[PDB]
JSON list of C-alpha atoms in Angstrom, two decimals:
[
{"chain": "A", "resi": 2, "resn": "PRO", "atom": "CA", "xyz": [2.62, -4.79, -45.35]},
{"chain": "A", "resi": 3, "resn": "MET", "atom": "CA", "xyz": [5.68, -3.77, -43.34]},
{"chain": "A", "resi": 4, "resn": "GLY", "atom": "CA", "xyz": [6.01, -2.44, -39.81]},
{"chain": "A", "resi": 5, "resn": "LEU", "atom": "CA", "xyz": [7.25, -3.28, -36.32]},
{"chain": "A", "resi": 6, "resn": "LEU", "atom": "CA", "xyz": [6.56, -2.10, -32.77]},
{"chain": "A", "resi": 7, "resn": "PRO", "atom": "CA", "xyz": [9.83, -2.56, -30.83]},
{"chain": "A", "resi": 8, "resn": "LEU", "atom": "CA", "xyz": [9.98, -1.62, -27.15]},
{"chain": "A", "resi": 9, "resn": "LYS", "atom": "CA", "xyz": [13.05, -0.42, -25.25]},
{"chain": "A", "resi": 10, "resn": "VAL", "atom": "CA", "xyz": [13.67, 0.14, -21.53]},
{"chain": "A", "resi": 11, "resn": "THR", "atom": "CA", "xyz": [15.84, 2.58, -19.59]},
{"chain": "A", "resi": 12, "resn": "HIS", "atom": "CA", "xyz": [15.57, 1.08, -16.10]},
{"chain": "A", "resi": 13, "resn": "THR", "atom": "CA", "xyz": [17.44, -2.04, -17.22]},
{"chain": "A", "resi": 14, "resn": "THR", "atom": "CA", "xyz": [20.61, -0.10, -16.44]},
{"chain": "A", "resi": 15, "resn": "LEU", "atom": "CA", "xyz": [21.41, 3.11, -14.55]},
{"chain": "A", "resi": 16, "resn": "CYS", "atom": "CA", "xyz": [24.16, 5.59, -15.41]},
{"chain": "A", "resi": 17, "resn": "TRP", "atom": "CA", "xyz": [25.89, 7.79, -12.83]},
{"chain": "A", "resi": 18, "resn": "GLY", "atom": "CA", "xyz": [28.28, 10.70, -13.24]},
{"chain": "A", "resi": 19, "resn": "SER", "atom": "CA", "xyz": [31.36, 11.93, -11.40]},
{"chain": "A", "resi": 20, "resn": "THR", "atom": "CA", "xyz": [30.49, 12.37, -7.73]},
{"chain": "A", "resi": 21, "resn": "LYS", "atom": "CA", "xyz": [32.58, 14.29, -5.19]},
{"chain": "A", "resi": 22, "resn": "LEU", "atom": "CA", "xyz": [32.68, 14.08, -1.39]},
{"chain": "A", "resi": 23, "resn": "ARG", "atom": "CA", "xyz": [30.41, 16.39, 0.61]},
{"chain": "A", "resi": 24, "resn": "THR", "atom": "CA", "xyz": [28.17, 16.44, -2.46]},
{"chain": "A", "resi": 25, "resn": "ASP", "atom": "CA", "xyz": [24.60, 15.28, -3.07]},
{"chain": "A", "resi": 26, "resn": "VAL", "atom": "CA", "xyz": [23.33, 13.58, -6.23]},
{"chain": "A", "resi": 27, "resn": "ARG", "atom": "CA", "xyz": [19.79, 12.45, -7.05]},
{"chain": "A", "resi": 28, "resn": "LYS", "atom": "CA", "xyz": [18.95, 10.09, -9.91]},
{"chain": "A", "resi": 29, "resn": "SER", "atom": "CA", "xyz": [15.59, 8.77, -11.13]},
{"chain": "A", "resi": 30, "resn": "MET", "atom": "CA", "xyz": [14.48, 6.21, -13.70]},
{"chain": "A", "resi": 31, "resn": "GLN", "atom": "CA", "xyz": [11.24, 4.68, -15.00]},
{"chain": "A", "resi": 32, "resn": "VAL", "atom": "CA", "xyz": [10.33, 1.52, -16.92]},
{"chain": "A", "resi": 33, "resn": "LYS", "atom": "CA", "xyz": [7.46, 0.96, -19.35]},
{"chain": "A", "resi": 34, "resn": "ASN", "atom": "CA", "xyz": [6.22, -2.30, -20.87]},
{"chain": "A", "resi": 35, "resn": "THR", "atom": "CA", "xyz": [2.81, -2.78, -22.48]},
{"chain": "A", "resi": 36, "resn": "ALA", "atom": "CA", "xyz": [1.58, -6.19, -21.34]},
{"chain": "A", "resi": 37, "resn": "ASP", "atom": "CA", "xyz": [-1.55, -8.06, -22.42]},
{"chain": "A", "resi": 38, "resn": "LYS", "atom": "CA", "xyz": [-1.62, -10.36, -19.39]},
{"chain": "A", "resi": 39, "resn": "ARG", "atom": "CA", "xyz": [-2.07, -9.66, -15.68]},
{"chain": "A", "resi": 40, "resn": "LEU", "atom": "CA", "xyz": [0.82, -11.14, -13.69]},
{"chain": "A", "resi": 41, "resn": "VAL", "atom": "CA", "xyz": [1.68, -10.37, -10.07]},
{"chain": "A", "resi": 42, "resn": "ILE", "atom": "CA", "xyz": [5.37, -9.97, -9.26]},
{"chain": "A", "resi": 43, "resn": "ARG", "atom": "CA", "xyz": [7.23, -9.05, -6.07]},
{"chain": "A", "resi": 44, "resn": "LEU", "atom": "CA", "xyz": [10.18, -6.64, -6.10]},
{"chain": "A", "resi": 45, "resn": "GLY", "atom": "CA", "xyz": [12.49, -5.97, -3.17]},
{"chain": "A", "resi": 46, "resn": "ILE", "atom": "CA", "xyz": [15.61, -3.93, -2.46]},
{"chain": "A", "resi": 47, "resn": "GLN", "atom": "CA", "xyz": [18.59, -4.53, -0.16]},
{"chain": "A", "resi": 48, "resn": "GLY", "atom": "CA", "xyz": [20.73, -1.96, 1.63]},
{"chain": "A", "resi": 49, "resn": "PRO", "atom": "CA", "xyz": [19.24, 0.68, 3.94]},
{"chain": "A", "resi": 50, "resn": "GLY", "atom": "CA", "xyz": [20.07, 4.25, 2.97]},
{"chain": "A", "resi": 51, "resn": "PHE", "atom": "CA", "xyz": [21.07, 3.98, -0.68]},
{"chain": "A", "resi": 52, "resn": "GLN", "atom": "CA", "xyz": [18.97, 2.19, -3.29]},
{"chain": "A", "resi": 53, "resn": "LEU", "atom": "CA", "xyz": [15.91, 2.44, -5.54]},
{"chain": "A", "resi": 54, "resn": "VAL", "atom": "CA", "xyz": [13.96, 4.58, -3.08]},
{"chain": "A", "resi": 55, "resn": "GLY", "atom": "CA", "xyz": [10.77, 6.41, -4.00]},
{"chain": "A", "resi": 56, "resn": "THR", "atom": "CA", "xyz": [7.37, 5.28, -5.25]},
{"chain": "A", "resi": 57, "resn": "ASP", "atom": "CA", "xyz": [8.67, 1.84, -6.19]},
{"chain": "A", "resi": 58, "resn": "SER", "atom": "CA", "xyz": [5.56, -0.34, -6.36]},
{"chain": "A", "resi": 59, "resn": "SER", "atom": "CA", "xyz": [5.59, -3.83, -7.87]},
{"chain": "A", "resi": 60, "resn": "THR", "atom": "CA", "xyz": [4.62, -6.31, -5.16]},
{"chain": "A", "resi": 61, "resn": "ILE", "atom": "CA", "xyz": [1.16, -4.73, -5.20]},
{"chain": "A", "resi": 62, "resn": "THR", "atom": "CA", "xyz": [-1.60, -5.83, -7.57]},
{"chain": "A", "resi": 63, "resn": "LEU", "atom": "CA", "xyz": [-0.03, -4.78, -10.87]},
{"chain": "A", "resi": 64, "resn": "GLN", "atom": "CA", "xyz": [1.66, -6.12, -14.01]},
{"chain": "A", "resi": 65, "resn": "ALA", "atom": "CA", "xyz": [4.21, -5.32, -16.71]},
{"chain": "A", "resi": 66, "resn": "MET", "atom": "CA", "xyz": [1.73, -2.76, -18.03]},
{"chain": "A", "resi": 67, "resn": "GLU", "atom": "CA", "xyz": [2.15, -0.88, -14.75]},
{"chain": "A", "resi": 68, "resn": "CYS", "atom": "CA", "xyz": [4.99, 1.56, -14.07]},
{"chain": "A", "resi": 69, "resn": "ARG", "atom": "CA", "xyz": [8.09, 1.29, -11.89]},
{"chain": "A", "resi": 70, "resn": "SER", "atom": "CA", "xyz": [9.93, 4.35, -10.57]},
{"chain": "A", "resi": 71, "resn": "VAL", "atom": "CA", "xyz": [13.42, 3.97, -9.11]},
{"chain": "A", "resi": 72, "resn": "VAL", "atom": "CA", "xyz": [15.09, 6.98, -7.49]},
{"chain": "A", "resi": 73, "resn": "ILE", "atom": "CA", "xyz": [18.53, 6.77, -5.88]},
{"chain": "A", "resi": 74, "resn": "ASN", "atom": "CA", "xyz": [20.39, 9.48, -3.97]},
{"chain": "A", "resi": 75, "resn": "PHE", "atom": "CA", "xyz": [24.16, 9.40, -3.50]},
{"chain": "A", "resi": 76, "resn": "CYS", "atom": "CA", "xyz": [25.94, 11.61, -0.96]},
{"chain": "A", "resi": 77, "resn": "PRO", "atom": "CA", "xyz": [29.08, 9.91, 0.42]},
{"chain": "A", "resi": 78, "resn": "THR", "atom": "CA", "xyz": [31.51, 11.62, 2.79]},
{"chain": "A", "resi": 79, "resn": "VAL", "atom": "CA", "xyz": [34.70, 9.70, 2.00]},
{"chain": "A", "resi": 80, "resn": "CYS", "atom": "CA", "xyz": [36.01, 7.57, -0.86]},
{"chain": "A", "resi": 81, "resn": "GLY", "atom": "CA", "xyz": [34.18, 4.28, -0.38]},
{"chain": "A", "resi": 82, "resn": "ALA", "atom": "CA", "xyz": [33.18, 1.16, -2.30]},
{"chain": "A", "resi": 83, "resn": "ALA", "atom": "CA", "xyz": [29.40, 0.93, -1.98]},
{"chain": "A", "resi": 84, "resn": "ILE", "atom": "CA", "xyz": [27.12, -0.18, -4.81]},
{"chain": "A", "resi": 85, "resn": "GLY", "atom": "CA", "xyz": [23.47, -1.18, -5.07]},
{"chain": "A", "resi": 86, "resn": "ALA", "atom": "CA", "xyz": [21.39, -3.45, -7.27]},
{"chain": "A", "resi": 87, "resn": "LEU", "atom": "CA", "xyz": [17.79, -4.49, -7.98]},
{"chain": "A", "resi": 88, "resn": "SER", "atom": "CA", "xyz": [16.56, -8.09, -7.89]},
{"chain": "A", "resi": 89, "resn": "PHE", "atom": "CA", "xyz": [13.51, -9.65, -9.55]},
{"chain": "A", "resi": 90, "resn": "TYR", "atom": "CA", "xyz": [11.30, -12.50, -8.33]},
{"chain": "A", "resi": 91, "resn": "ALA", "atom": "CA", "xyz": [9.31, -15.11, -10.26]},
{"chain": "A", "resi": 92, "resn": "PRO", "atom": "CA", "xyz": [5.49, -15.02, -10.41]},
{"chain": "A", "resi": 93, "resn": "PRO", "atom": "CA", "xyz": [3.15, -17.14, -8.25]},
{"chain": "A", "resi": 94, "resn": "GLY", "atom": "CA", "xyz": [1.77, -19.21, -11.11]},
{"chain": "A", "resi": 95, "resn": "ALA", "atom": "CA", "xyz": [3.73, -21.52, -13.40]},
{"chain": "A", "resi": 96, "resn": "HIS", "atom": "CA", "xyz": [4.23, -18.89, -16.10]},
{"chain": "A", "resi": 97, "resn": "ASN", "atom": "CA", "xyz": [6.86, -19.98, -18.63]},
{"chain": "A", "resi": 98, "resn": "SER", "atom": "CA", "xyz": [9.99, -18.28, -17.31]},
{"chain": "A", "resi": 99, "resn": "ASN", "atom": "CA", "xyz": [13.45, -18.70, -18.83]},
{"chain": "A", "resi": 100, "resn": "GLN", "atom": "CA", "xyz": [16.06, -18.45, -16.07]},
{"chain": "A", "resi": 101, "resn": "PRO", "atom": "CA", "xyz": [14.43, -15.36, -14.51]},
{"chain": "A", "resi": 102, "resn": "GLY", "atom": "CA", "xyz": [15.90, -13.13, -11.82]},
{"chain": "A", "resi": 103, "resn": "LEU", "atom": "CA", "xyz": [17.52, -10.25, -13.69]},
{"chain": "A", "resi": 104, "resn": "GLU", "atom": "CA", "xyz": [19.91, -7.88, -11.92]},
{"chain": "A", "resi": 105, "resn": "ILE", "atom": "CA", "xyz": [20.47, -4.22, -12.81]},
{"chain": "A", "resi": 106, "resn": "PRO", "atom": "CA", "xyz": [24.08, -2.97, -12.57]},
{"chain": "A", "resi": 107, "resn": "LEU", "atom": "CA", "xyz": [24.19, 0.03, -10.24]},
{"chain": "A", "resi": 108, "resn": "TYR", "atom": "CA", "xyz": [27.73, 1.42, -10.12]},
{"chain": "A", "resi": 109, "resn": "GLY", "atom": "CA", "xyz": [28.36, 4.44, -7.92]},
{"chain": "A", "resi": 110, "resn": "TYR", "atom": "CA", "xyz": [31.19, 5.50, -5.62]},
{"chain": "A", "resi": 111, "resn": "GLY", "atom": "CA", "xyz": [32.46, 8.62, -3.88]},
{"chain": "A", "resi": 112, "resn": "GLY", "atom": "CA", "xyz": [35.09, 11.14, -4.90]},
{"chain": "A", "resi": 113, "resn": "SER", "atom": "CA", "xyz": [38.42, 11.85, -3.23]}
]
């Protein structure tokens, strides 16, 4: 009687490579989490142009069991300091939440 079913995520954090000016880079990530309950959460992004663009759907009628796709495209023209980030919101009900509101570190700048 021995066995475990651990679950890991890849969306928790995004990794970017060396980007040069006048160049275009496209990154994509997905998160998976088998849930037994049906909770409705709302996800939003800030910063027009660069961010988790794509088929990002969370606010809709879904739950942890669903799937979240985050695709970001970087294509700066000059060395700048612009970075994005994803924010999470608490559910409507009074679900036991321990200091929610996680933020994913999205580091990405332009070359020189």
